[PDB]
Amino acid sequence: PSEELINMRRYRNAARKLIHHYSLNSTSSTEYKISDVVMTMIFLLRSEKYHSLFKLLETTFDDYTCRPQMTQVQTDTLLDAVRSLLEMPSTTIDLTTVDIMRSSFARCFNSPIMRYAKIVLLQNVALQRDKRTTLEELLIERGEKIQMLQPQQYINSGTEIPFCDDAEFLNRLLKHIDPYPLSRMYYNAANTMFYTTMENYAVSNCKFNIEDYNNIFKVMENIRKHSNK
Amino acid sequence: IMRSSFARCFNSPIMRYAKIVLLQNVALQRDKRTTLEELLIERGEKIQMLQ
Amino acid sequence: ELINMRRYRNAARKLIHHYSLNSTSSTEYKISDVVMTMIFLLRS
Amino acid sequence: EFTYPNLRPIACEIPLSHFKELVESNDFLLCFNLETSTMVKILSLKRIFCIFQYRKQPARYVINLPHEEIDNLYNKLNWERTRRLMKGDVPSNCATVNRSSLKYIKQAQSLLGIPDYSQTVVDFVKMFQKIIFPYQLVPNVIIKLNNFDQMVSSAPNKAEPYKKIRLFCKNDSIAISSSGIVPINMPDFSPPNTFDYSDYANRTNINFVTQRVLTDGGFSSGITVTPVKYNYYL
Amino acid sequence: CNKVRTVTEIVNSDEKIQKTYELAEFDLKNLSSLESYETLKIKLALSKYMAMLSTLEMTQPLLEIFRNKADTRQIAAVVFSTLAFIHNRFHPLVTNFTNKMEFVVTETNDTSIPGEPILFTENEGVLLCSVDRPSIVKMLSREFDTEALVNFENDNCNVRIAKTFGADFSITEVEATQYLTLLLTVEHAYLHYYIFKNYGVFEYCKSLTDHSLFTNKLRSTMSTKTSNLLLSKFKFTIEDFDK
User: Fold this and answer.
1) Is the backbone of residue A102 left (phi > 0), alpha (psi -120 to 50) or beta?
2) Angle at CA A117, nearest 5°, toward A115 and A120?
């Protein structure tokens, strides 16, 4: 009958939504409820399972940038429990994402501000380096070793094009495909690629990622003016 | 009193992330307009439909 | 156990006194301390 | 039965219309009219099977029907035969699952060499019989049998793998379960045992080994492992 | 004001009648007729591409392919066919080009690269290309997607309300949705590839620092047919940059 006993299902699902958001960056939502955050915490405390994660997060409460020392076996159990709680199909969730999530809360608590915060702190301070480098240097250093690497296949590379001609088959396919609001849907994939733009790196990540990324779409204005000469 | 104060406290959106508003018109009369001549070039397909 | 009863009670008492009396928003207070407040209540 | 897709057209109801033809030939086509009472269908089929069992050679059924309801009626026949056996002669009567089994065995033959696409199942059955005892363990064929029947099996009807086979042979002091050797007349596995003590099958150890293996193999995906477990005997 | 007016008149001024109308809502019908069949065309194209992929002995779902790393052959073939499709869609004409091309998988982070997951080395003696299988697998880790959504609309009575009143491999759609990812990726690569194949390397100092003005070079370059920017309002919040 306790205050804990009310809705473990609610607490679980809400917490999972929040966590899946912060980690996989999955999907648009009005993802927020302070009370549900607290529910998440207490849902951790109510299991000895995930106690480790709770303790980790608690370390954040003093906001300081430091990354905690690994203890290998316990970190492995950490990964285990994390994947279990996410119920993801063996999706190779990893220490990097772990740390990012960790730092997520030490970002959030910084604000005592309650009205609202559009702020999207895309960057993470704590990424285990003295100072962010440029990109160009990285480009050099990578390309160097890159040229070393030997080819991995032989394209026969002669005259080849594939096609198929079963018009009725293709139209059957079309009708199978018909219902889906692809227009609405594919925005998700576009956002996926965007988030991937930052997932790319956790190592002196490119500070600027903005205006050129918009010029990508301004290519649309370029195209429209090309069409209209 | 502080009950109601907590009620006002706990609505406080946080930590949102990038989202996009791709929906709107692209074109209008402020764009190239189809011509009956090229529509003739199209419809001439009926001179193969025939039968 | 992990719980610093000392600092938890300290911050909770201070925050509750302040906020309950003032009945108004205060930018001073990290929400963390609210979290600690409910934790303390659930323990005690 | 046999199915090719010469034939004797046998009227699907009248017994003596083809009398003595059922003595002479072995290749019997069958039919039915749309209105027929299922009871009448069962009755006629029973009569045909009795007279065939009196016949001196295994003639071949062929039937021109959608046959899904015929598999249903076969299940009915199973009930019927059990009903008889409540008072019966305990005949070694032959019977078979007719679709799931069927296709499976067809695939089996196809993957093997097919000297006779018409070869009877019992052929393969006995062929494995030749070798079971020397290896004292259960063929996967027989295991999939009593697995993929709707009812007399692991039974997707009710999801009942619990029907594990205890298999015994003359003079044995022991039996072969679905799950290895067992001592006689006992419930398939002791709740106590020389248990799979977690100092083996420690997650940690498993994980480490797995990492080793994946590293060495250069394999990104598709590997899972599980420690073995033991019943009465080791 | 476009409040079109109209008149009939009998011979010899026997009678004259007037009426009026508006070109409004005609525009709405035109817009609907456009967008409908345009979307149809795009969907059709996608379908064609997917069907073309379907020929390639798909004993496995796509996801499996990249989730494995042991193979390279299937991956290379997929990449190649994608390039071919793009090229043809720009060039309604069959092509086979420099008959020597090869790929290498950037199997490790230390070989990884910011942004562009694909890199053409246009001629190290001959063309070569790079593939980040680990990332591609990240992208295809998917689950970002669920169709249950809501979308921008405004001023519906004028703008949208009219739109209220109009209308084995048996695989589901989510995977197909995922394909669009690599479609866009290979497109973005094709841009740079085409450019440099038509011009020098040094402009990489610009384009690959920031693609940006490259559209200026693309002026007069596009074949008078668009690609894959229908919902042209792709944008996010900007002023928040707080530089």
Assistant:
1) alpha
2) 170
Neighbours of chain A (3+ CB pairs under 8 A): B, C, D, E
Determine contact, residues E231/E152, Cβ cutoff 8 Å.
no
Sign of the Cα torsion D165, D166, D172, D173 reads: positive
**Six token digits for residue E31:** 């817009």
Q: How far apart are CA D28 and CA D7, in angstroms?
A: 6
Would you state the structure tokens that stand for residue A182, as one six-digit string? 């692809």
For β-strands E128-131 and E118-121, DSSP reports them as antiparallel
Which residues of chain B make contact with C20, given a CB cutoff of 8 A?
A: 1-2, 5
Cβ of residue B26 closer than 8 Å to a chain E Cβ: yes
Write the DSSP assignment of chain E as a string of letters. ----EEEEE-GGGS-EEEEE--STTHHHHHHHHHHHHHHHHHHHHHHHHHHHHHTTT-SS-HHHHHH--S--HHHHHHHHHHHHHHHHHHSSS-----S--EEEE--SGGG--SS-SEEEE--SSS-EEEE-HHHHHHHHT-----S--------HHHHTGGGGG-------SHHHHHHHHHHHHHHHHHHHHHHHHHS-STTHHHHTT--TTHHHHHTTTS-S---S--S-------GGG--
Return the H-helix or E-strand segment holding D28.
strand D27-30
Contacts of D138 (CB under 8 A, 6+ apart): D132, D165, D167, D176, D178
Going by C-alpha positions, the residue among A132, A82, A123, A119 that lies closest to residue A100 is A123
- Rounded to the nearest 10 degrees, how much is the dihedral formed by the CA atoms of C26, C28, C31, C32? -150
How are beta strands D180-183 and E5-9 bridged, if at all?
Answer: unpaired
Q: Taking Cα atoms as reference points, which of A211, A28, D226, A99 lies closest to residue E145? A: A28
**Beta bridge partner(s), residue D183:** D174
The verdict on a CB contact (< 8 Å) between A38 and C35 is: yes
Rg of chain D over Cα atoms, rounded to whole angstroms, equals 24
Question: Cβ distance B17 to A25 under 8 Å?
Answer: yes
Long-range CB contact pairs, A135-139, < 8 A, 24+: A135/A206, A135/E114, A135/E209, A136/E209, A138/A204, A138/E114, A139/E113, A139/E114, A139/E208
Handedness of CA B35, B38, B42, B44 (dihedral sign): positive
Structure tokens, D191: 């709740």
**Closest approach of A204 to chain C, Cα-based (Å):** 29
Query: Are E144 and A186 spatial neighbours (Cβ–Cβ below 8 Å)?
Result: no
B32 — contact with chain E (CB < 8 Å)?
Answer: no
With CA atoms as reference, report the closest residue to D119 among D107, D134, D106, D130: D106
AA identity, residue E74 = Q
Q: How far apart, in whole angstroms, are the C-alpha atoms of residue A46 and residue A41?
A: 9
Q: For residue B27, with 0-12 CB atoms within 10 Å meaning exposed, 13-18 middle and 19 or more buried, which class applies?
A: middle
Closest CA to A34 of E31, D181, B11: B11
Note whether E63 and A140 are within 8 A (CB): no
Chain B residue with minimum CA distance to C22: B2
Residues forming beta bridges with residue E17, ordered by sequence position: E8
Resolution value (Å, 1 decimal): 4.7
Query: Alpha helices, DSSP H only, in chain A?
Result: 8-24, 34-45, 51-59, 72-86, 95-108, 135-148, 167-177, 182-199, 211-227
Tokens 């479609």 — which residue? E183
Residue D77, classed as helix, strand or coil, is: helix
List A residues 139-198 in contact with D (Cβ-Cβ < 8 A): none
User: Phi, psi at residue A151, to the nearest 5°?
Assistant: -60, 150
Contacts by residues E152-161 (CB-CB < 8 Å, ≥ 24 positions apart)? E152/B21, E152/B23, E152/B24, E153/B23
> Helices A95-108 and A72-86, interaxial angle, to 10°?
80
Of B18, B22, B27, which is closest to E233 when you measure between CB atoms?
B22
Those residues whose C-beta lies under 8 Å from the C-beta of residue D3, and which sit 6 or more positions away, are D62
